[PDB]
Design a protein around this ligand. Structure first.
Ligand SMILES: [Zn+2]
Length: 595
DNA sequence: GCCTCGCGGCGGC
DNA sequence: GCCGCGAGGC
């Protein structure tokens, strides 16, 4: 197993100073933080652990307070001896999700500075789709070492012990083993990473410097107005009733129900539909009423609970603000998923979604400033296909949907019917998602091979797009992956799936990911760029959220004119300067007003 | 306290 | 590409 004889628990200053001297001369050192809660802003540090060499790791208890607990170094002293090591940029620390550890250390006025290697990210940059990137999983994968899962030394459920209650030597067993494994994992992964500059560059210059900016954004969080949501909740209740009523105008009783089960699904028999919702029961049809009205219902109920009713319950008591959680190593293409307030999931073009964005308030004398990337994936696609047509559309500011419509439908720009710009929009966005022709016919759902004819007309006027496409489908099967403009690799194991039906999903994915991924890398770079500028100049502005391509700030009303200008300089410049970039900036007293 | 289906999650303690 | 939480039958 692992226990009390491996790692040392440091309960006295003399030993601690000895360990600091060796940390001062180590090339890189690991390190962990042990707390009494996962809330990075309300958690109290309970102990730390460091490992300098496989097997050589120790635990330092500072705040264990159970019945009759042994005397320990105080948190204050342990930290004042550890602080200069912790803030020394020349001291390269290694850890598993060092964003947490940065936040906790930030709570004591300590700015963690040697954030050199984060194992969870090395895993993610090594292979995005390889599997779960949590340490227990990396331990079985990279080292076949079954670790001590947290649940063992703390218990499960309600009477789960928090770390400070857990006995000094058991705590030590987990925390020091953690520190040690983290280091061994770094020792396996960093070599492989160094192999080939694509991935290594993303790690070195996007992924790792982003970690402390993500701890800043979460700890800033957002200010929300619980009143506005409550009004929209009463209203959402009302609206559900109609659906309930409108839903029932298309049928039925009977009911016991609602809500799912055999009750709504019953009608798949007599309300003659083809035959687990959102999904199946393709109403992709105008009528039948049942798989249409109950979808309008599920959607607003969702909206109601998930946002309108949960957002008021998530205000942090210490800050009076909501702190969304950004997960850096979870999506397959390189994007950031926000959870708890999952900003990505609030509907952009919907009337009930525009109310939610109104709840996000700018504090007194501050306004919300939004900076969004103007359809960057199409500008990225334009850059990946070397198609002079698309390049020029963007060069002289032509609305690409209308210019594309003028070429595809062979007609003068000035007279483009809006009826044609829509058909041009569908195709254009289609190619970004690697839309398999029928995809167009089902998105712009009403034509058949007319879409096929459309694709022909677009590729004849824009050959570069399918040049791009074939080249990508090629390197996809060939190498087993596709890379973004900087080197991020999506590994596609099923591109060669021996006609495994949706092997073609990997083909789609192959054309999709380079665009999604380069956009993602571009935003991360912009984030790093802006944050840097904030840490140096410290203007009255805080970066409060990031979602889908826009970055939301909270700039002081007086300073907005220069700040919106700086964002405009930073973002479309020290980012992917080889793509033609446009960032739209808005200001309003709330997120939607700034949109 | 128990089972199955449907939507939103995956790190850190 | 696999796990969880929450609702409805019960
Ligand atoms: Zn930890």
């Amino acid at each position: 197993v692992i226990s009390y004889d491996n790692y040392v628990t440091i309960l006295d200053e003399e030993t601690l100073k000895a360990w600091i001297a060796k940390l001062e001369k180590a090339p890189v050192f690991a390190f962990a933080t042990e707390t009494d809660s996962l809330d990075n802003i309300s958690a109290n540090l309970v102990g730390l652990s460091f490992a300098i060499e496989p097997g050589v790791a120790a635990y330092i208890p500072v705040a264990h307070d159970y019945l009759d607990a042994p005397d320990q170094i105080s948190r204050e002293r342990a930290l004042e001896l550890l602080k200069p090591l912790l803030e020394d940029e020349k001291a390269l620390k290694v850890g598993q999700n060092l964003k947490y550890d940065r936040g906790i250390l930030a709570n004591y006025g300590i700015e963690l500075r040697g954030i050199a290697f984060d194992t969870m990210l090395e895993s993610y940059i090594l292979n995005s789709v390889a599997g779960r990137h949590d340490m227990d999983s990396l331990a079985e994968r990279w080292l076949k070492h079954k670790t001590i899962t947290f649940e063992e030394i703390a218990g499960k459920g309600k009477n789960q012990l928090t770390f400070n209650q857990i006995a000094l030597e058991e705590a030590g067993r987990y925390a020091a083993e953690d520190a040690d494994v983290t280091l061994q994992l770094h020792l396996k992964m960093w070599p492989d990473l160094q192999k080939h500059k694509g991935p290594l560059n993303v790690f070195e210059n996007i992924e790792m410097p982003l970690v402390p900016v993500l701890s800043r954004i979460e700890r800033n969080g957002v200010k929300i107005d619980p009143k506005v949501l409550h009004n929209h909740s009463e209203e959402l209740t009302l609206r559900l009733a109609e659906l309930e009523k409108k839903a029932h105008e298309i049928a039925g009783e009977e009911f016991n129900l609602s809500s799912q089960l055999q009750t709504i699904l019953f009608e798949k028999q007599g309300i003659k539909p083809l035959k687990t919702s959102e999904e199946v029961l393709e109403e992709l049809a105008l009528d039948y009423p049942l798989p249409k009205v109950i979808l309008e219902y599920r959607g607003l109920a969702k909206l109601k609970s998930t946002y309108t009713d949960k957002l008021p319950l998530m205000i942090n008591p210490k800050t009076g603000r909501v702190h969304t959680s950004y997960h850096q190593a979870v999506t397959a293409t390189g994007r950031l998923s926000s959870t708890d307030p999952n900003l990505q999931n609030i509907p952009v073009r919907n009337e009930e979604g525009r109310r939610i964005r109104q709840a996000f308030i700018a504090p007194e004398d501050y306004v919300i400033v939004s900076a969004d990337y103007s359809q960057i994936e199409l500008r990225i696609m334009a850059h990946l296909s070397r198609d002079k047509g698309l390049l020029t559309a963007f060069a002289e500011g032509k609305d690409i949907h209308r210019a594309t419509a003028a070429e595809v439908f062979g007609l003068p720009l000035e007279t483009v019917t809006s009826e044609q710009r829509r058909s041009a929009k569908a195709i254009n966005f289609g190619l970004i998602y690697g839309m398999s022709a029928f995809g167009l016919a089902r998105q712009l759902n009403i034509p058949r091979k007319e879409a096929q004819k459309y694709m022909d007309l677009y590729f004849e006027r824009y050959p570069g797009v399918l040049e791009y496409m074939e080249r990508t489908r090629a390197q996809a099967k060939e190498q087993g992956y596709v890379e973004t403009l900087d080197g991020r690799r999506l590994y596609l194991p099923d591109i060669k799936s021996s006609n495994g039906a949706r092997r073609a999903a990997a083909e789609r994915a192959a054309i999709n990911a380079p665009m999604q991924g380069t956009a993602a890398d571009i935003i991360k770079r912009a984030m790093i760029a802006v944050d840097a500028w904030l840490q140096a100049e410290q203007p009255r502005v805080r970066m409060i959220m990031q979602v889908h391509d826009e970055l939301v700030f909270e700039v002081h009303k007086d300073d907005v004119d220069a700040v919106a200008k700086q964002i405009h300089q930073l973002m479309e410049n020290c980012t992917r300067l080889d793509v033609p970039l446009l960032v739209e900036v808005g200001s309003g007293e709330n997120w939607d007003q700034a949109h």
